[PDB]
Amino acid sequence: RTIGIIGAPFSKGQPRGGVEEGPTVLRKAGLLEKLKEQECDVKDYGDLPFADIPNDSPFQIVKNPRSVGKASEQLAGKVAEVKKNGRISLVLGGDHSLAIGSISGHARVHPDLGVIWVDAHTDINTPLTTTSGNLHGQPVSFLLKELKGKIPDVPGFSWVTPCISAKDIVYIGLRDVDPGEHYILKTLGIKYFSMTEVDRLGIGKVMEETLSYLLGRKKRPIHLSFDVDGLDPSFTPATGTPVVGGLTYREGLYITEEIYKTGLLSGLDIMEVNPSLGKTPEEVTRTVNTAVAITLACFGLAREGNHKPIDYLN
Amino acid sequence: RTIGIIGAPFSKGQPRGGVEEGPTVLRKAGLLEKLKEQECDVKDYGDLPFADIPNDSPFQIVKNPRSVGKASEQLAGKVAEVKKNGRISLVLGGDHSLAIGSISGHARVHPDLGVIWVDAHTDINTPLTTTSGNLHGQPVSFLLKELKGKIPDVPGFSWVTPCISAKDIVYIGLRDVDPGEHYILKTLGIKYFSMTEVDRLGIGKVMEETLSYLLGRKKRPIHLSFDVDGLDPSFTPATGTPVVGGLTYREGLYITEEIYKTGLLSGLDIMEVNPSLGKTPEEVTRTVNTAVAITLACFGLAREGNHKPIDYLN
Amino acid sequence: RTIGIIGAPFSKGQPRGGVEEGPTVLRKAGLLEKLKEQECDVKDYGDLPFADIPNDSPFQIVKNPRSVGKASEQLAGKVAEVKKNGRISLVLGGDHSLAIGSISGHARVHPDLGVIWVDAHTDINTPLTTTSGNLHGQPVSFLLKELKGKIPDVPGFSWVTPCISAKDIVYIGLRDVDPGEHYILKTLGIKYFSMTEVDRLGIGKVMEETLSYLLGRKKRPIHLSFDVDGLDPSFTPATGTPVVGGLTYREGLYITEEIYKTGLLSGLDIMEVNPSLGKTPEEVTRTVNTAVAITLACFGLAREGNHKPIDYLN
Numbered sequence: 001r002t003i004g005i006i007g008a009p010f011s012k013g014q015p016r017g018g019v020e021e022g023p024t025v026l027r028k029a030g031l032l033e034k035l036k037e038q039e040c041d042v043k044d045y046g047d048l049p050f051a052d053i054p055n056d057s058p059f060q061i062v063k064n065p066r067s068v069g070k071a072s073e074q075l076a077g078k079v080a081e082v083k084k085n086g087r088i089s090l091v092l093g094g095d096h097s098l099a100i101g102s103i104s105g106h107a108r109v110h111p112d113l114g115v116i117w118v119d120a121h122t123d124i125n126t127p128l129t130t131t132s133g134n135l136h137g138q139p140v141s142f143l144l145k146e147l148k149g150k151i152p153d154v155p156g157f158s159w160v161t162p163c164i165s166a167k168d169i170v171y172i173g174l175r176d177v178d179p180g181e182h183y184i185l186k187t188l189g190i191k192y193f194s195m196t197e198v199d200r201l202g203i204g205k206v207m208e209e210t211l212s213y214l215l216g217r218k219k220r221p222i223h224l225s226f227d228v229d230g231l232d233p234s235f236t237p238a239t240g241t242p243v244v245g246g247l248t249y250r251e252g253l254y255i256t257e258e259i260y261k262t263g264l265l266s267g268l269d270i271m272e273v274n275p276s277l278g279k280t281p282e283e284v285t286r287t288v289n290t291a292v293a294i295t296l297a298c299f300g301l302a303r304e305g306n307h308k309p310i311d312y313l314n
Numbered sequence: 315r316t317i318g319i320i321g322a323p324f325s326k327g328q329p330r331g332g333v334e335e336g337p338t339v340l341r342k343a344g345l346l347e348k349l350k351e352q353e354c355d356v357k358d359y360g361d362l363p364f365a366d367i368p369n370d371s372p373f374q375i376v377k378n379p380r381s382v383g384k385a386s387e388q389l390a391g392k393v394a395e396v397k398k399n400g401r402i403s404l405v406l407g408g409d410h411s412l413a414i415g416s417i418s419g420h421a422r423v424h425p426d427l428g429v430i431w432v433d434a435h436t437d438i439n440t441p442l443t444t445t446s447g448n449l450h451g452q453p454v455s456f457l458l459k460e461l462k463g464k465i466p467d468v469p470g471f472s473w474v475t476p477c478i479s480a481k482d483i484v485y486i487g488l489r490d491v492d493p494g495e496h497y498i499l500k501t502l503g504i505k506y507f508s509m510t511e512v513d514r515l516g517i518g519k520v521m522e523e524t525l526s527y528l529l530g531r532k533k534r535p536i537h538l539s540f541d542v543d544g545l546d547p548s549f550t551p552a553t554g555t556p557v558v559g560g561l562t563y564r565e566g567l568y569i570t571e572e573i574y575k576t577g578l579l580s581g582l583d584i585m586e587v588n589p590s591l592g593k594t595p596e597e598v599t600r601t602v603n604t605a606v607a608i609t610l611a612c613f614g615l616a617r618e619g620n621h622k623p624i625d626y627l628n
Numbered sequence: 629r630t631i632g633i634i635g636a637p638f639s640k641g642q643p644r645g646g647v648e649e650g651p652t653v654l655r656k657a658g659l660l661e662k663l664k665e666q667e668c669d670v671k672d673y674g675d676l677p678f679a680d681i682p683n684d685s686p687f688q689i690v691k692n693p694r695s696v697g698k699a700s701e702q703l704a705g706k707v708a709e710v711k712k713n714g715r716i717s718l719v720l721g722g723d724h725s726l727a728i729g730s731i732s733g734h735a736r737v738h739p740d741l742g743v744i745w746v747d748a749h750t751d752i753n754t755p756l757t758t759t760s761g762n763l764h765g766q767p768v769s770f771l772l773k774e775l776k777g778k779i780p781d782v783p784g785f786s787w788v789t790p791c792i793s794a795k796d797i798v799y800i801g802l803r804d805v806d807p808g809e810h811y812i813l814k815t816l817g818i819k820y821f822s823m824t825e826v827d828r829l830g831i832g833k834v835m836e837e838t839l840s841y842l843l844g845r846k847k848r849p850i851h852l853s854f855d856v857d858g859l860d861p862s863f864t865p866a867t868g869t870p871v872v873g874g875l876t877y878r879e880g881l882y883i884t885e886e887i888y889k890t891g892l893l894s895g896l897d898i899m900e901v902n903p904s905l906g907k908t909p910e911e912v913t914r915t916v917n918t919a920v921a922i923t924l925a926c927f928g929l930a931r932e933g934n935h936k937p938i939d940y941l942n
């Protein structure tokens with residue numbers, strides 16, 4: 001595929017600051033080189049320089065709103081830029097709050113996009129239902145059209161315009177959903193496959209249904225927002241909000257291999273990788289290596305193997 | 315649900331004594347508080363005080379028969395008490411021999427009960443087929459109606475009256491069954507899903523069949539006897555008889571989430587958790603935390619989330 | 629079953645030399661005693677004495693060709709010997725290059741054999757497509773009838789005569805296939821179930837299809853070549869070419885339990901176990917114990933249990 005890499009070293013959507021190193025550790029693992037080692041056309045747009053917003057007091061319970069709102073507004077512009085360039089945007093992120101800007105900018109160019117959100121969490125708390133105040137657990141609430149009128153005017157997000165309907169998104173991997181978030185899921189009728197469904201159906205049927213659900217009516221661009229805590233912490237331990245009983249390494253690769261095979265991937269987010277949280281140097285490399293593997297699968301790397309359109313035996 | 319907690323610090327059904335700490339470590343993990351944090355009405359009946367039976371020599375090969383028989387006779391009375399109180403009995407146990415009293419007392423009030431036994435073992439050795447002499451590996455033999463006449467009059471169990479037919483029980487998780495036990499399984503035609511069946515069908519179909527098998531003819535109270543060694547030792551390491559290749563954390567939660575959803579759970583046993591056997595302080599907390607998670611799922615905690623019957627967005 | 633054990637302490641098919649200890653550590657774990665503990669008739673043909681071929685310079689890129697070719701030629705003769713004795717050959721090996729001789733000797737007596745290759749790799753590189761030069765990653769290329777004319781005359785293999793068609797083999801567990809190997813797979817139309825297929829279908833359906841694929845037309849002898857790196861390194865860490873996201877312990881036992889149940893197993897290879905590569909004494913015992921478990925399942929050991937044709941209750 002044709003990829004446009006965007007580094008987004010941002011962490012103000014949650015407490016821990018090490019998430020800002022995501023772009024760096026991922027690049028160091030040879031992500032660019034590896035993508036090119038495939039049938040991939042890669043153009044790196046660099047790391048977006050996020051300026052400090054020294055004066056950013058909480059809005060009610062919500063923390064660092066102006067900093068988060070500015071980082072997403074900026075990211076939205078860059079993403080829309082790479083999309084206008086006929087490239088699949090690859091956002092190497094910090095925290096998941098950046099999804100607000102990534103999906104927003106993606107939808108400007110492709111308003112008909114469908115979203116696949118792999119995460120242990122729904123991240124759909126409103127500024128009024130959140131208990132932590134961390135914006136990385138509220139991105140979806142700002143993007144849903146049906147929730148407009150329920151989201152207060154939070155400083156830093158006046159530029160936001162809900163771009164996706166509750167019907168254009170599917171969750172995969174849920175295992176720690178807040179009560180208000182659960183109420184929102186059932187009320188707006190959002191499609192999801194919690195770990196319970198994955199256990200019941202198998203990742204195979206889950207992906208069959210997910211894609212059918214989003215592309216049955218018509219093929220449309222796909223945005224995959226992958227939070228690394230969606231995978232079990234035995235695979236991605238260096239992350240801020242780990243939850244046991246997650247998707248396996250294999251299921252992670254299955255999801256992405258299937259997404260790739262649709263040929264419809266147009267936007268990708270690799271989020272919440274925080275090297276600073278590894279209990280050992282190995283947990284860091286384990287988290288980074290898994291994050292990279294997931295990324296490569298999104299762009300063609302298949303476990304059964306790959307080969308060029310040439311005669312290898314000759 | 316409406317729960318009646320019963321602590322049963324007993325270990326004479328096997329060699330290791332640390333199993334007697336089960337009720338304590340589980341309570342310390344905040345089990346009561348956590349259940350109440352749900353739509354749960356909790357009444358704790360305390361820890362049953364098991365008196366010492368100093369004079370308890372083996373009956374043939376069977377060890378501590380009078381001590382085990384007395385502990386089960388006592389537990390049976392308490393369980394029947396909580397059942398008469400319209401509450402689901404939750405037996406925080408020591409070793410699995412206590413299942414004799416738990417199921418017995420449960421059946422006094424609800425003679426039509428069906429049993430789901432999650433375990434790596436069948437625990438159906440008779441006093442004559444057992445090679446270890448440990449009674450925690452023989453509870454089922456004392457409960458089956460079809461085995462009466464094959465169980466000798468063992469000191470301490472004259473109060474026992476087989477309350478369940480081979481047709482009212484289903485095993486899930488088997489991977490270390492003795493030859494005589496296997497002979498009993500095939501001969502009495504007991505329904506089971508060994509790890510081989512779980513691998514073949516998937517935990518989803520396994521639960522579909524298990525519940526259909528026990529409730530197809532008519533809905534009836536369900537007794538879930540959960541031996542923590544049914545789960546893989548990577549999840550519940552602090553237990554006396556671990557066996558590799560066990561049920562996963564996810565499968566453990568799936569089984570219980572499905573049981574809960576039947577609305578028919580009326581008796582639950584959480585057994586064999588032995589803190590003293592953890593190779594590290596973390597293996598102990600890992601075993602206890604998993605045991606607690608399984609318990610909460612039996613009473614409504616769902617991985618997709620939970621919410622009260624109120625308007626969260628208002 | 630009736631087993632003929634053959635120890636093959638050979639490692640020249642790859643760089644690391646510790647693989648030569650496979651037969652020793654497996655025997656020390658009590659493999660013979662354990663098989664006999666079952667309804668197994670065991671005859672050990674000892675460890676084949678592989679003489680040193682001091683003068684063995686590379687053939688182009690291929691390493692230790694004469695040593696590897698001689699070790700396989702020798703093994704082929706022994707395997708054919710045990711087969712003529714009405715016994716299932718059990719090759720406790722070193723590296724996977726020995727599969728050349730094992731399958732060759734097996735096919736002399738049973739030309740209609742079908743092959744099941746459990747491995748993370750296809751091991752089908754030709755002397756011309758290999759990049760490593762290690763012959764343990766090329767055994768299949770020497771055995772396929774359809775590849776004859778594409779394999780150069782490599783010193784030490786003039787005795788080789790392709791004995792299996794691309795249609796008589798099934799791969800299970802693939803996750804690291806080279807480009808040329810992938811080209812060969814799709815070109816010769818070889819049937820395989822990479823980790824992607826296992827994830828999609830489940831090991832249950834995978835085995836249903838595998839056996840149906842090989843025995844649908846007619847029942848025929850089965851040769852199972854099991855490379856321990858086919859299993860995840862969390863189960864078999866002491867091996868030379870580990871690859872994450874492998875088959876689970878359970879899936880490993882499922883495959884073999886199903887193979888056993890066909891009653892058609894006639895040739896088995898347990899390869900690539902290298903004690904010298906364990907990062908700890910426990911990783912070695914973990915690798916060896918798993919390798920043994922897989923072996924026992926091939927010969928009847930079932931997770932649901934086993935019993936003799938006698939009355940256990942009497």
Ligand SMILES: N[C@@H](CCCC[B-](O)(O)O)C(=O)O
Pocket residue numbers: 095096097119120121122123125130131132133134136137138176178227229241272
């Ligand atoms: N639901 C919690 C945790 C959200 C976790 C955010 B995430 O998924 O981006 O890591 C909260 O609102 O603070």
Ligand SMILES: N[C@@H](CCCC[B-](O)(O)O)C(=O)O
Pocket residue numbers: 409410411433434435436437439444445446447448450451452490492541543555586
């Ligand atoms: N079958 C063995 C082990 C039984 C294990 C008992 B259990 O399941 O309660 O831990 C025995 O009879 O000693």
Ligand SMILES: N[C@@H](CCCC[B-](O)(O)O)C(=O)O
Pocket residue numbers: 723724725747748749750751753758759760761762764765766804806855857869900
């Ligand atoms: N494909 C690689 C690795 C092969 C691994 C060989 B095996 O499967 O026997 O361990 C190579 O040709 O060197």
Ligand code: NI
Pocket residue numbers: 119120121227229230241
């Ligand atoms: Ni998350």
Ligand code: NI
Pocket residue numbers: 096119121123136227
């Ligand atoms: Ni998230």
Ligand code: NI
Pocket residue numbers: 433434435541543544555
């Ligand atoms: Ni058990």
Ligand code: NI
Pocket residue numbers: 410433435437450541
């Ligand atoms: Ni038990």
Ligand code: NI
Pocket residue numbers: 747748749855857858869
């Ligand atoms: Ni291999």
Ligand code: NI
Pocket residue numbers: 724747749751764855
């Ligand atoms: Ni191999």
